[PDB]
């Protein structure tokens, strides 16, 4: 948590200039970094990383990863997991058909907002499921039954440099990336999109009049969590402008889509104000894929009821 | 048939106003972009600036804002434009097209893509020399034919500076044709010769005659090549 | 300037000087001393209308391999001055074309000088001048040591010459220039240009007393 | 991991001088030691200790022995 003498790099991402310590204490460290601009905030100008007034900062180690990988959680004995293999299952009640397992099947834990990606898939008819429909504060949850193919890409050819703040603290940061300046994105085919969202559009109808309408709108406010897209994918944290997707109208009755996304490394998720996490730099163009299966949307609420 | 020239005065004083004429003919200048290009004798050919199809031109930075490229539309030129000039300028001047190309690697939509110009048609190229000396116009001297395939020429002398136009019969000759480059005396001035091979029969029938053109001096000779009299 | 030297009929590789940085474009170009210069390949390894398929480029396959132009089948026009224009996006703007690379053919086959005096002429003797012109066309290796010789002793003073320089027919071309009064012209019996190449002599001897 | 402005002891052995922290921060200590030659590096010469741009360095606390004891490793029953 040093003062950031950045400058616009050659506008996200900054090229700084600052003053750190090496493997001795009195011998200070005039070295430079690469972040992005929802890494530092200022105080030419000069910056200080976002959370060093607010949760302690703390990097990662390099060799632990964050892919997510299936857990099956288990009872022991005198304990059972029950099991309802109901299809068309609402979310609670009776289920007709209930089996005995002592574990669960594979379970990533996709730390995910919105999108919900990698998760499991319904059958027959996509099921609605919501703890209160009437109730707007309630999150409604979606789970699909045809996954779709999203790819998300950061096509920068970034390189990891190492300084020694030590002794035994070693850090790796950005250093001058190769390739190309290519923001973030990731891509959606408008057509089974299309086809997926007009499925939802009659599923939503079950919960509603038979001529109504379904209006779709991007993120209103909060924290960029809660507006944009955040998900894990090869290390780097990513956050899309999900504003291209929900902009539709929907009454009774082959390219693909691009959303700008951004990343950001020093993570506070949670919200926990007190520690906090870097993201360690991943070297060569990140290419993830995935496949979408939920999603957690909220009415607006207060309104002339089933005008719209 | 696109064809350009290149147009100078090929002597300018320093720190004056040098002007380069680029004439254009088998096309509009409305469909691609255009740009200067010299070479310095001791340096490699340097790139000088362009110019666009919506009449916005571009200087490289190096010229520390000397430069001035227009174009007419009536008269289809390209005009060059350098003041403040200094002998350093010397060089052999080139006007070829430029051509856009956009080399795309990854989405348009951010803008994912690089423009790169590529000169595809040139010019013939004109020497401009930039000096305080005055002009000194050529002597053109008909060698004339041995009596005993013969060989005759034309000799021209001392002048400045280069370059010389020499053809034979108003470019009605081009076979045989061989012109020897100037020489450079300790005068500072210019030499060269110019020989055609043609057969002896031809000698007392055709009307051979060379004709030297020197810009600079803005002088046309035409010399009438006649054996001797013995 | 970078030199190089291939021999006749070998497939030749100039390489590029600056290397690439991200997604590129190259383009190679030759260029002629006193001629316009003309680009050989255009992105990567697209090729113009009129350049032959001897010449090659490098393919853009993300990186990992360097651009180079691969000139097969060398002969004695491919003697020029190459340049590499890199356009890649971290550099951005490339107005420098790099680094000279000055290709030069060996093994040619040697051809005799064809050497031809010339007396200055009649209408220069009556401007109060006089001037010997020898000129040597058609010679290889380009190496020639011109002398002037007055009668049987040679002269050193007003002689002027110029360096060899090739023509179309991948063949060097030298001129000398003896700058003289027209006394002196018409006082010596004879007078002739000696010219020595790759051992060999060949003289050209010219007269005022014949035709 | 200070600047060690050593002299040669009066060769392995170095005597130090640098600068510290006391028990108050802005107060800094000015004190000497005394170390052996594979303890220190140079950067007079100036030295810093050898582990200062790898490992973290800790030292042990002084009570804690580090003479060998004699271990019986055991298994429960059923084996
Ligand atoms: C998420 O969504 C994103 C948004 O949709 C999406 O982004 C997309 O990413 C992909 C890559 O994944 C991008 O694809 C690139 O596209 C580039 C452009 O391709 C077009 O243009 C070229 C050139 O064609 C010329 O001629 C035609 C007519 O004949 C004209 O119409 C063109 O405009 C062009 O004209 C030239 O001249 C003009 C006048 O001077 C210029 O103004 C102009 O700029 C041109 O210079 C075509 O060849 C392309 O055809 C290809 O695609 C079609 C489908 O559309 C195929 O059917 C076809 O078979 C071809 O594959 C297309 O029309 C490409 O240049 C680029 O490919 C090069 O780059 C990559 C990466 O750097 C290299 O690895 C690769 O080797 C390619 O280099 C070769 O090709 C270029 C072509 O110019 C050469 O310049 C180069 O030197 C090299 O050629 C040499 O090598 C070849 C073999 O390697 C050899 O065969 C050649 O003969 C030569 O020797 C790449 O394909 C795409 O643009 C993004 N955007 C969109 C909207 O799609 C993203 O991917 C998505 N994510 C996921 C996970 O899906
Ligand atoms: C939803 O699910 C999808 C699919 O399950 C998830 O997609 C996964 O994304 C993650 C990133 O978030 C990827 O992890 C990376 O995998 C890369 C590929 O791993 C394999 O290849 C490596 C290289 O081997 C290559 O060459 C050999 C020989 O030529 C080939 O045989 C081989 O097929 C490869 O082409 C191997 O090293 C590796 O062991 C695998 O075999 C890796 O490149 C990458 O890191 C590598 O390098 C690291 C640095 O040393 C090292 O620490 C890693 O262990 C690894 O070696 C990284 O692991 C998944 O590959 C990708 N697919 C799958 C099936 O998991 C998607 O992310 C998910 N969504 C979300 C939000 O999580
Ligand atoms: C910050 O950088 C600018 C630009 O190089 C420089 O003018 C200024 O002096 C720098 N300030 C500090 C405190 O380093
Ligand atoms: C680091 O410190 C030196 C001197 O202590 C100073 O000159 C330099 O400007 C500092 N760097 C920054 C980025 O402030
Ligand atoms: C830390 O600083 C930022 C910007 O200066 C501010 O928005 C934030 O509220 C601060 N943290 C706390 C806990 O006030
Ligand atoms: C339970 O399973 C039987 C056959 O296995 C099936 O006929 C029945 O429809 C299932 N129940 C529900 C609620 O789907
Ligand atoms: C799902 O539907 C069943 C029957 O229609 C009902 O008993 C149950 O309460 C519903 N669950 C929710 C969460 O609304
Ligand atoms: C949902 O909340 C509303 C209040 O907004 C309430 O009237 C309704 O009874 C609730 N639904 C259930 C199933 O409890
Ligand atoms: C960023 O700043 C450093 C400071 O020394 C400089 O060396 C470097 O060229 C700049 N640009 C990049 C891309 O690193
Ligand atoms: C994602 O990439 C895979 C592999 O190239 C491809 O099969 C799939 O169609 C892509 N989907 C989208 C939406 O780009
Ligand atoms: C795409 O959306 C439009 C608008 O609702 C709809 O009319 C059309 O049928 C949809 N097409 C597909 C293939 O989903
Ligand atoms: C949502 O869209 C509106 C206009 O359609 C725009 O003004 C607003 O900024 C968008 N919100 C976000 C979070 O992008
Ligand atoms: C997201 O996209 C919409 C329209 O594409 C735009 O209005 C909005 O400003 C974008 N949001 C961000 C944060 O870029
Ligand atoms: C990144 O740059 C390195 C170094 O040039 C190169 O070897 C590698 O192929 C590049 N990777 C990508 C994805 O551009
Ligand atoms: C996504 O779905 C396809 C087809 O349904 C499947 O082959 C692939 O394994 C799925 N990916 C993941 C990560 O489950
Ligand atoms: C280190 O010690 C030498 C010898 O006493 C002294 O001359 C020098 O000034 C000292 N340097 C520092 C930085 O203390
Ligand atoms: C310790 O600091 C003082 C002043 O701050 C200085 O005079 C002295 O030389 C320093 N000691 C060493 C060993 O550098
Ligand atoms: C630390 O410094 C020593 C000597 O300067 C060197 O031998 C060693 O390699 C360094 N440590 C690392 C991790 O490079």
């Known amino acids: 948590c040093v003062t950031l003498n950045c400058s616009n790099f050659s506008g996200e991402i900054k090229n700084c200039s600052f003053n750190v310590t090496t493997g001795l204490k009195d011998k200070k460290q005039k070295m430079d970094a690469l972040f992005h601009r929802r890494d530092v905030v200022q105080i030419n100008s000069y910056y200080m990383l976002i959370s060093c007034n607010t949760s302690t900062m703390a990097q990662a180690c390099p060799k632990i990863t964050f892919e997510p990988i299936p857990i099956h959680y288990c009872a022991p004995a005198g304990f059972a997991i029950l099991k309802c293999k109901d299809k068309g299952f609402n979310g609670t009640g009776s289920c007709k058909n209930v089996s005995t397992v002592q574990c669960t099947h594979g379970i990533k834990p996709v730390v995910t907002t919105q999108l919900l990606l990698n998760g499991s898939t319904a059958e027959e008819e996509i099921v609605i499921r919501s703890e209160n429909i009437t109730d707007n504060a309630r999150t409604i949850i979606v789970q699909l039954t045809k996954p779709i193919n999203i790819n998300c890409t950061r096509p920068g050819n970034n390189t990891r440099k190492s300084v020694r703040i030590g002794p035994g603290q070693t850090f790796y940061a950005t250093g001058a990336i190769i390739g190309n300046i290519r923001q973030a994105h990731c891509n959606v085919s408008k057509t089974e999109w299309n086809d997926t969202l007009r499925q939802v559009a009659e599923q939503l109808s079950k919960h509603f009049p038979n001529a109504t309408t379904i209006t779709f709108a991007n993120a209103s406010g909060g924290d960029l969590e809660i507006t944009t897209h955040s998900f894990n994918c090869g290390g780097e944290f990513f956050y899309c402008n999900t504003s291209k997707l929900f902009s539709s109208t929907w009454d009774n009755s082959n390219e693909t889509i691009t959303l700008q996304c951004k990343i950001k490394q020093i993570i506070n998720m949670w919200q926990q104000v007190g520690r906090a996490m870097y993201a360690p730099p991943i070297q060569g163009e990140i290419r993830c894929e995935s496949n979408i299966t939920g999603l957690l949307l909220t009415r607006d609420g207060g309104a002339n009821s089933s005008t719209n | 048939q696109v064809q350009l020239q290149e147009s100078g005065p090929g002597l300018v004083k320093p720190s004056e106003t040098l002007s380069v004429t680029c004439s254009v003919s088998?096309?509009?200048?409305?469909?691609?972009?255009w740009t200067w290009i010299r070479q310095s004798p001791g340096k490699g050919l340097e790139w000088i600036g362009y110019?666009?199809?919506?009449?916005?031109?571009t200087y490289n930075p190096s010229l520390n804002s000397r430069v001035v490229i227009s174009r007419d539309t009536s008269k289809n030129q390209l005009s060059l434009k350098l003041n403040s000039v200094t002998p350093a300028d010397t060089a052999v001047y080139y006007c070829a097209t430029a051509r856009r190309g956009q080399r795309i690697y990854g989405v348009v939509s951010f803008g994912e893509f690089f423009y790169y110009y590529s000169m595809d048609v040139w010019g013939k190229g004109t020497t401009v020399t930039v000096s305080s000396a005055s002009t000194k116009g050529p002597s053109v001297f008909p060698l004339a034919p041995s009596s005993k395939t013969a060989a005759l020429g034309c000799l021209v002398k001392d002048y400045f500076p280069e370059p010389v136009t020499v053809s034979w019969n108003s470019g009605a000759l081009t076979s045989g044709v061989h012109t020897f480059p100037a020489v450079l005396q300790s005068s500072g001035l210019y030499s060269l010769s110019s020989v055609v091979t043609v057969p002896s029969s031809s000698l007392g029938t055709q009307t051979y005659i060379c004709n030297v053109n020197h810009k600079p001096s803005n002088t046309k000779v035409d010399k009438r090549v006649e054996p001797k009299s013995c | 300037v970078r030199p190089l030297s291939v021999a006749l009929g070998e497939t030749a590789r100039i390489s590029c000087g600056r290397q690439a940085l991200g997604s590129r474009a190259v383009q190679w170009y030759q260029h002629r001393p006193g001629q316009a210069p003309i680009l050989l390949i255009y992105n990567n390894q697209d090729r113009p209308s009129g350049i032959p398929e001897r010449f090659s480029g490098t393919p853009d396959i993300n990186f990992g391999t360097r651009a180079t132009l691969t000139i097969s089948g060398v002969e004695a026009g491919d003697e020029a001055d190459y340049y590499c224009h890199m356009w890649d996006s971290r550099s951005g703007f490339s107005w420098s074309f790099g680094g000279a690379t000055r290709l030069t053919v060996l093994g040619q086959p040697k051809a005799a000088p064809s050497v031809t005096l010339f007396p200055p002429s009649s209408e220069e003797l009556q401007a109060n001048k006089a001037t010997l012109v020898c000129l040597i066309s058609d010679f290889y290796p380009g190496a020639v040591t011109v002398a002037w010789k007055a009668d049987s002793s040679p002269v050193k003073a007003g002689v002027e010459t110029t360096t060899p320089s090739k023509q179309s027919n991948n063949k060097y071309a030298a001129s000398s220039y003896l700058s003289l009064t027209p006394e002196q012209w018409k006082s010596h019996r004879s007078y002739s240009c000696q010219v020595t190449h790759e051992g060999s002599t060949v003289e050209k001897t010219v007269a005022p007393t014949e035709c | 991991c200070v600047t060690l402005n050593c002299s040669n002891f009066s060769g392995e052995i170095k005597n130090c001088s640098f600068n510290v922290t006391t028990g108050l921060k802005d107060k800094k200590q000015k004190m000497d030691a005394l170390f052996h030659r594979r303890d220190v590096v140079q950067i007079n010469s100036y030295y810093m200790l050898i582990s200062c741009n790898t490992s973290t360095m800790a030292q042990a606390c002084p009570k804690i022995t580090f003479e060998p004891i004699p271990i019986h490793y055991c298994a429960p029953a059923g084996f």
């Open positions: 088998g096309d509009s200048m409305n469909n691609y972009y």
């Open positions: 110019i666009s199809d919506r009449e916005s031109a």
